[PDB]
Write an enzyme that holds these catalytic residues in place. Structure first.
Site, PDB file in Angstrom:
ATOM      1  N   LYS A   8      21.988  36.230  -3.052  1.00 29.45           N
ATOM      2  CA  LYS A   8      21.698  34.906  -3.514  1.00 29.45           C
ATOM      3  C   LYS A   8      20.928  34.212  -2.454  1.00 29.45           C
ATOM      4  O   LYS A   8      19.867  33.650  -2.711  1.00 29.45           O
ATOM      5  N   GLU A  12      29.482  28.568   3.253  1.00 27.74           N
ATOM      6  CA  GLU A  12      28.797  29.833   3.350  1.00 27.74           C
ATOM      7  C   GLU A  12      29.169  30.361   4.696  1.00 27.74           C
ATOM      8  O   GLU A  12      29.684  29.634   5.539  1.00 27.74           O
ATOM      9  N   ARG A  13      28.952  31.677   4.912  1.00 25.57           N
ATOM     10  CA  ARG A  13      29.537  32.383   6.022  1.00 25.57           C
ATOM     11  C   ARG A  13      28.827  32.054   7.289  1.00 25.57           C
ATOM     12  O   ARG A  13      27.656  31.704   7.265  1.00 25.57           O
TER      13      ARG A  13
END
Lengths: 100, 187, 50, 501, 469, 470
Positions: free
Chosen positions: F158, F184-185
């Protein structure tokens, strides 16, 4: 035990102080607590169901729930400037819109 | 402002009564009269124990209240309003509860503290006095804040002693020391 | 080495139960009374240091 | 001896001072106490019940502070006093935990004598920032050919093992630990991984067998086994991954590279579900509290490949999620999938089909990392993926009575051989230097002709042949890690030589 | 002094007592309320504080007058153990329900006990032969193991177990425990009679089996602590007598199920499919107190009544966690007429390995799995089109698998009565040979009807001659 | 400062209730700061429960808090820093430099809340945005100042799709951009920080043509909710006050939805359908309405959405599906087909595709494509059982063309030289329309199907035909 605005300490201390009612609960209302756009007002005994009420915040609301101890107004606006103890005038007019 | 909130329910009732009569500056009178009406409630044994539990109307309840304030003239006016509230809330069951709580609030206003020196045995009077003295000597007792010291017998803590008051304890019982000793020798 | 180590553990738990026996011996005595006096004065020393 | 040690232990008990805070238990049972008092109290603090129980505190309420027991109910009783430990939950962390099985608290449950701990740490520690990180430049190869080639595993990276329960679910992970013996035997600390196998929710017998297996393969001597057996408290189980994590952080902090297997992470979720439902928090989707996502996310993000400045220390993670019914649409598997950096789906049908490993490569991805595998192995397995994908497509087409043309059957025939090539028996890791040849042979279609039954024989024999003659060649693959022209040619000639005989 | 109380509430079988004196109760204590129906035993399970316990009541709670005198007997319910447990069927409290009079005891032991330590664990894998072809072939059991069955609704859940009891426990010399939680009483009487008849219970002599039996009639609470009672009896053999035990439990679904009933009343917000939020802990305690330790090797057999025939339900799910072998038996395979109804792709054991039952066994098993997996795979095609429209190579596999499916049904000796077909106990050594031959297609040349409901490979051959007539 | 002091009453996760003293009660949506050794814990006032007690949501981990802890009130919704001195640094939820860029703010701060512009304010747009990504250009052209929406599931690369957009469009565009990451990471974070430093958008010398607001999944759910608002206000400052064209990018809005669902339960709101907040519609609505091109600057937002388990019937994706101008679905199947872009063409609908907006020719070419692809899909079942038999020759040529088209839509990404190795192609929109037109006419039906696969324009397709021919 039951939850009633007799629990609410500010209301309760006034009741104990022999101060109550008298055009506070006529049409006149006062917010007890406002959270989630669901103001719960103590007063407004003259309110007609679903009727438009105008806060001192100026926000307008309707009163779907005429709970036996509070009138659960639904605020038509943001809670940004709505906070406890707000005077709540009762517009006194059931939901109506100009037609023509 | 509240003398430090007691409970959430029933002690909210007591808190309200308290702060309202604190601003009336008539707490000792209120408390004393509440004790007196409580005493005559208890000393009405049938239907002053057996009509603390609702079973009858609001209107009939009100008339029970009216008999109660007939039983003695004077009861402040705040505790006469408190009776009204309770009649309206139809809960006299937590009337003595409120009385006890109002007592806690009252003796908080006095600053009178209650403590305990739990042991598994009745303790000497010399120990009672020495500890009461010690506790007063230390800042554990505020001074202006009084103290009661109650030994209770609880075999639970086998021998020794534990001094308790406030949120400060020193536990030098034998059972607890044994617990750690045993535990450390379970290694 | 394995059986030797097992024996050290076995000895330790045997001698452990003897500690339990010594605990039962202590708790009979009116040292049960006399050490309460010791605790009393010790708490006096502690709370006065507060 | 034993007498002197006992004398030391008793001697190590001595004196005390006034205990701050108290509070009296009231309602209590289930494992969740609620105590009145404890006005001062840190959140997540450990509070010592007078029974002997120690309990973390998860609810601070203006009524009754809710202390979750880490001990048995029976010990606790009404109106007991609890005196606050004064410590937010903390774990002993050190080198000595290497070669130790330890329970959640950190006490050895294998009882190899009390741990040698170089510090204590706190159980909740927030994930390393964007600033302290380097991108993953160090492979870690599991020694399972399908894994290394198809789903490359790199240090740092969280890679999710997901699939139907105990279908050797543990065994897939154990294989990784076993191949990390190869580096362990070797040298260079940063080229070594220490390994923490965390076992939550598993029966004592499985765990005992597991520690036995690790000792059997003599891979116990660099492992930490953190355990929380099935009997053990739901609070201890909830706390168990987070206290494993801190032990891992001690490695991470040291600049050491290590790998932490969180098996089963699914059992953490069950534990938190219980915990919440007896703290009477409103229950989330499927009765798992909503902040289960938060719980898992904070846990998983603590493992990282740090920056060069921050010593590079790569804690690598492998969560293991049991998939009940094999449907990952369940709330906990969906949540985990998002969190993790890859997914390694295993399928039951393929286990029965005799593909062991039974990993379904169609569902298995490593969404990041490709410098997470050996350059040589990347080159050879470049079209291994393509061939396999084509095999899958062709095989699908073949179903429902379609009469295949020869061109499709070239693919099919090639494809079948690859499948046989992948299979590996449980507890049989391989050396990557000798996985590169096998793939070369397969991809260059030298096995396509070779009869299906004797592929396994070919594999065994080929390896023996490479050991015999081209042991120089293997040494080079170890040394240079990318196939040179000379190696490609040597390998081509060798492979050709072994096709027949 | 007597910890008297009154019964503040009787909300279902979750009576609440209010102790007067401030002498404390303790969690998992037992209380005796004396009733004119004899005593009633209750077990303190929660402390609600202010000297009001909330107690699980083992036996029925009808009649109780709110404000009923209590006496606290202290600590968990104490069973009576000894060699005298052997040859006696006992109530939860321990009273003989077979009415064999006072059970002389040495030690009376608490129902609750702690799971033995990680250090105490010992793991072994001595292949136990059941003489049931499917069991041996697919997932052989092994000594000290925890064996698992995931039988459907009345699939003769008991019947499968009965065959196992008949074979394995008469081939076991050591002590053995039968614990039947909430089983149908009439079947239990049949079992009691059969055991007495087969001398396993010899009432004149000694019995190498002891029994605890809990009727399905019994109130939920009693059924909840039936397990703990049995578990104590097992521990006495394991520990105190030291002798290797055996244990049979049927159904451990009743243990979970009972728990689900009480939890709501107890005051718990229930987890999905109504299951108790204490499911994991309770299951955990039960299954870690059953284990092979240095003290003794207790081979245990657990039966799960799959509820509504859904194995993804949380109660079956947590059982799968605590077993060393499982042999899921499903209604579908039963409908196909295959007795035993064990699913052949849903059996597993850690005791199936090439280093355990040998490379040859493992190889044999590999082929069996592969053939059957193919056979299941082509079920769609088989239905949509004809079986002749199957590819010829596959059609051979299908024919082999069709034979394998029929072959696996072996008459059982306890079933021999019901089916009418004389039982067959086929040696493990014989089994490996029998399937091996079929895999080499030796006897694949004779009808599926011949393979259906018969014993060893040799028996198939003879039955071919019979069929030929 | 005002002595608006409250003592914490209940720490029960993120929900922390405070007990302000009488007559000094904060107002809903205020911001409370509590001095802690963790800096200042910020609690956002979210309800009044009466009796001088508010119920507020935490923005930071609530571990090690003290029941009764004095709470100052800074009032009103959290005031972030805004400027062009917010360009080029990583700004956390409460605004702090999480990249040690020191003091952030120009001369101004603004509140996290802002009202959505009124109907009167709205100003219609209908521009065009060429992305170079052929599938996007032909079958769902974007439009500047749009509300582009990247619906796709888990791990559809994504970030990678977005990365391509940033690589091309951001550098190209003169407008400032704000890359906002919600949950998000930090793995993704370190890569993004590094990557956009490399692409120079973040120029660590000169001014960056982008700002970063990284909110990560390790931040509490409460903090996760108000990552979005913070980023939004930075964008609003650009849009309104700096007047500039913006080219906002936010990630991932399922994390915003999810975050709101989680704290809904905690706030005591009885869960709605599929456990989502009962306020789902309006909470989404406030975010979506706030982002719009008015008389003031054009926000060209690209908003990521994660579709849990590719189930679009789930209310959270389905509600978002309405709110975004130019939907795109990136499906797993197409990824599996090996086609990266993973865009599912028949399931990508855009209001910007019209025979007027992009004119009749563009439209007609794309209409023929849509029908062709739909035919191939409809016929796939026929091919499955019946095969090439009672299926028309004409249909077979259409099927062959569809396979060619399917792989003509396959063209690499420049940012997937590391996730592939073939460099992406920014093929001109007009050129793509023409090139696809050629295919439909069958002018390149002599070209192998695989010679359309993973290459650029017609010139490249021919070149790969030759390459394959050899």
């Amino acid at each position: 035990t039951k939850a009633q605005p007799t629990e609410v300490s500010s209301i309760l201390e006034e009741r104990i102080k022999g101060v109550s009612d008298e055009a506070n609960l006529n049409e006149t209302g006062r917010v007890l607590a406002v959270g989630d756009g669901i103001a719960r007002v103590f007063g407004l005994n003259n309110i007609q169901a679903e009727e438009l009420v105008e806060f001192s915040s100026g926000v307008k609301g309707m009163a779907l729930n005429l709970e036996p101890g509070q009138v659960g107004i639904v605020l038509f606006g943001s809670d940004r400037l709505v906070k406890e103890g707000e005077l709540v005038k009762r517009t006194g007019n059931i939901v109506d819109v100009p037609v023509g | 402002p509240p003398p430090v909130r007691l409970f959430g329910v029933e002690g909210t009732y007591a808190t309200a009564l308290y702060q309202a009569a604190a601003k009336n500056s008539s707490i000792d009178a209120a408390f004393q009269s509440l004790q007196k009406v409580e005493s005559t409630v208890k000393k009405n044994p049938k239907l002053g124990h057996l009509l603390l539990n609702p079973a009858l109307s609001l209107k009939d309840r009100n008339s029970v209240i009216d008999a109660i304030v007939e039983t003695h003239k004077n009861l402040d006016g705040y505790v006469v309003n408190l009776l009204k509230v309770l009649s309206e809330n139809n809960r006299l069951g937590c009337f003595e509860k409120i009385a006890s709580d109002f007592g806690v609030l009252n003796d908080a206003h006095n600053g009178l503290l209650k403590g305990t020196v739990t042991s598994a045995e009745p303790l000497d009077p010399k120990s009672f006095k020495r500890i009461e003295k010690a506790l007063s000597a230390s800042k554990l007792v505020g001074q202006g804040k009084s103290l009661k010291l109650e030994n209770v017998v609880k075999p639970e803590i086998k021998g020794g002693l534990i001094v308790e008051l406030g949120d400060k304890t020193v536990d030098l019982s034998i059972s607890t020391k044994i617990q750690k000793l045993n535990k450390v020798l379970e290694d | 080495v394995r059986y030797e180590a097992s024996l050290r553990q076995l000895e330790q738990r045997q001698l452990a139960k003897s500690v339990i026996s010594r605990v039962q011996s202590e708790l009979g005595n009116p040292k049960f009374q006399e050490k309460v006096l010791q605790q009393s004065i010790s708490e006096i020393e502690q709370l006065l240091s507060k | 001896e034993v007498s002197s040690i006992l004398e030391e232990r008793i001697k190590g008990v001595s004196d005390e001072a006034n205990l701050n805070e108290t509070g009296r238990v009231l309602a209590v049972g289930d494992g969740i106490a609620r105590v009145f008092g404890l006005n001062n109290i840190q959140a997540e603090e450990l509070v010592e019940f007078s029974s002997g129980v120690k309990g973390m505190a998860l609810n601070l309420e203006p009524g009754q502070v809710g202390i979750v027991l880490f001990g048995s109910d029976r010990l606790v009783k009404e109106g007991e006093l609890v005196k606050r430990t004064g410590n937010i939950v903390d774990v002993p962390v050190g080198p000595g935990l290497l070669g130790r099985v330890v329970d959640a608290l950190g006490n050895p449950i294998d009882g190899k004598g009390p741990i040698d701990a170089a510090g204590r740490s706190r159980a909740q520690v927030k994930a390393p920032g964007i600033l302290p990180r380097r991108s993953v430049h160090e492979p870690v190869q599991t020694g399972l050919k399908a894994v290394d080639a198809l789903v490359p595993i790199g240090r740092g990276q969280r890679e999710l093992i997901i699939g139907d329960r105990q279908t050797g679910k543990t065994a897939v992970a154990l294989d990784t630990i076993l191949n990390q013996k190869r580096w362990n035997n070797g040298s260079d600390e940063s080229k070594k991984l220490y390994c923490v196998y965390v076992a939550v929710g598993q029966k004592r017998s499985t765990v005992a067998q597991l520690v036995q297996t690790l000792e059997q393969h003599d891979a116990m001597k660099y492992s930490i086994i953190v355990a929380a057996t099935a009997s053990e408290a739901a609070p201890l189980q909830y706390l168990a991954p987070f206290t494993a994590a801190s032990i891992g952080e001690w490695f991470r902090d040291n600049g050491k590279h290590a790998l932490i297997v969180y098996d089963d992470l699914s059992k953490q979720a069950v534990a938190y579900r219980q915990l919440s439902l007896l703290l009477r928090r409103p229950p989330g989707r499927e009765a798992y509290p909503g902040d289960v996502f938060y719980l898992h996310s904070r846990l998983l993000e603590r493992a990282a490949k740090l920056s060069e400045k921050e010593g590079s220390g790569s804690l690598t993670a492998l969560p293991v999620i049991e998939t009940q019914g094999g449907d990952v649409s369940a709330y906990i598997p969906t949540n985990v999938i998002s969190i993790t950096d890859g997914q390694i789906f295993l399928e039951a049908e393929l286990f029965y089909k005799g593909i062991r490993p039974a990993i379904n490569v169609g569902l298995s991805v490593s969404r990041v990392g490709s410098a997470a595998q050996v350059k040589a192995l990347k080159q050879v397995a470049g079209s291994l993926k393509l061939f396999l994908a084509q095999y899958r497509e062709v095989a699908a087409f073949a179903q429902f009575g379609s009469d295949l043309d020869a061109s499709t059957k070239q693919t099919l025939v090639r494809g079948e051989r690859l499948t046989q090539l992948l299979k590996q028996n449980q507890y049989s890791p391989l050396a990557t230097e000798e996985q590169v040849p096998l793939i070369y042979a397969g991809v260059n279609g030298h096995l396509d002709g070779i009869e299906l039954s004797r592929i396994g024989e070919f594999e065994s024999s080929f390896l023996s042949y490479l050991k015999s003659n081209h042991n120089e060649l293997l040494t080079e693959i170890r040394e240079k890690g990318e196939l040179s022209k000379e190696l490609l040619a040597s390998l081509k000639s060798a492979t050709e030589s072994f096709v027949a005989t | 002094t007597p910890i008297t109380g009154k019964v503040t509430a009787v909300i279902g079988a979750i009576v609440d007592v209010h102790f007067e004196q401030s002498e404390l109760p303790a969690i998992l204590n037992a209380l005796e309320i004396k009733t004119p129906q004899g005593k009633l035993v209750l077990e303190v399970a929660q402390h609600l504080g202010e000297n009001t316990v909330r107690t699980i009541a083992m036996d029925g709670t009808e009649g109780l007058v709110r404000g009923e005198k209590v006496l606290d007997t202290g600590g968990p319910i104490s069973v009576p153990v000894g060699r005298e447990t052997l040859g006696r069927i006992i109530n939860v409290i321990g009273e003989p329900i077979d009415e064999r009079g006072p059970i002389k005891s040495k030690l009376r032991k608490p129902i609750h006990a702690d799971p033995p330590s990680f250090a105490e664990q010992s793991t072994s894998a001595e292949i136990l032969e059941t003489g049931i072809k499917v069991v041996d072939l697919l997932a052989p059991y092994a000594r000290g193991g925890k064996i698992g069955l995931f039988g459907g609704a009345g699939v003769g859940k008991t019947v499968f177990i009965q065959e196992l009891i008949n074979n394995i426990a008469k081939a076991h010399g050591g002590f053995s425990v039968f614990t039947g939680v909430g089983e149908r009483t009439r079947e239990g009487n049949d079992l009691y009679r059969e055991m007495k008849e087969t001398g396993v219970i010899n009432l004149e002599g000694e019995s190498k089996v002891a029994l605890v039996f809990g009727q399905m009639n019994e109130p939920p609470g009693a059924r909840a602590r039936v397990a703990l009672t049995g578990l104590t009896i097992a521990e006495y053999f394991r520990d105190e007598e030291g002798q290797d035990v055996l244990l049979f439990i049927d159904n451990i679904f009743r243990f979970t199920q009972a728990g689900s009933e009480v939890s709501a009343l107890l005051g718990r917000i229930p987890s999905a499919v109504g299951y108790q939020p204490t499911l994991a802990t309770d299951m955990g305690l039960l299954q870690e107190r059953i284990t092979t330790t240095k003290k003794g090797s207790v081979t245990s057999v657990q039966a799960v009544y799959v509820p509504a025939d859904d194995l993804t339900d949380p109660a079956p799910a947590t059982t799968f966690a605590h077993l060393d072998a499982t042999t899921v038996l499903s209604r579908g395979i039963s409908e196909l007429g295959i007795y035993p109804a064990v699913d052949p792709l849903d059996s597993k054991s850690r005791l199936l390995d090439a280093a355990v039952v040998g490379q040859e066994h493992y190889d044999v098993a590999s082929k069996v799995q592969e053939t059957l997996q193919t056979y299941k795979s082509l079920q769609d095609i088989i239905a949509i089109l004809g079986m002749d429209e199957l590819s010829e190579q596959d059609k051979l596999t299908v024919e082999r698998a069709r034979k394998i499916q029929r072959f696996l049904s072996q008459p059982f000796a306890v079933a021999e009565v019901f089916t009418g077909i004389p039982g067959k106990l086929v040696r493990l050594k014989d089994t490996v040979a029998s399937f091996k031959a079929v895999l080499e297609g030796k006897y694949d040349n004779i009808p599926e009807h011949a393979f259906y409901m018969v014993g060893g490979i040799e028996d198939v051959v003879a039955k071919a001659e019979k069929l030929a007539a």
